[PDB]
Amino acid sequence: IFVYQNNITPSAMKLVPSIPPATIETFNEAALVVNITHHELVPKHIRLSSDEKRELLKRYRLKESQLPRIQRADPVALYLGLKRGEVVKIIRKSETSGRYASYRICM
């Protein structure tokens, strides 16, 4: 995780996905002032294991992409550090059912 102050050079930004399997994540300290997952409208997002995903895709007979989507650059997706393929479990409070578990695939 690299917390930068104002801006990063376009040449320096190319060096971010240059060393696999190691991953690099950049964040502006002004954007980290307030935690987004602490907001009342942002439910609890939980990243699922390769086994938990495998089980979910079986119960509903789903294909990776056949699921609701979460963008790889989505604020919460960037917070949990989601990679493409990773499934996230969303426990959201409904004004009809209360606690409800939904899911989203990061592509």
Query: Rule CB under 8 A: is residue 87 a binding residue for other proteins?
Result: no
Query: Rule CB under 8 A: is residue 103 a binding residue for other proteins?
Result: yes
Query: Rule CB under 8 A: is residue 104 a binding residue for other proteins?
Result: yes
Q: Where in 21-50 is the site for other proteins (CB under 8 A)?
A: 30-31, 33-46
Two structure tokens written together for 11: 């040449």
Query: Taking a C-beta distance cutoff of 8 angstroms, is the pair 16, 22 a contact?
Result: no
- For the chain, helix (H) and strand (E) counts, in that order, are 2, 6
Query: Rule CB under 8 A: is residue 100 a binding residue for other proteins?
Result: yes
Query: Rule CB under 8 A: is residue 14 a binding residue for other proteins?
Result: no
Q: What is the DSSP letter of 23?
A: -
Calculate the CA 73 to chain-centre distance: 8
Q: Can you give the binding site for other proteins, defined by CB under 8 A?
A: 17, 20, 30-31, 33-46, 59-71, 74-77, 84-85, 89-105, 107
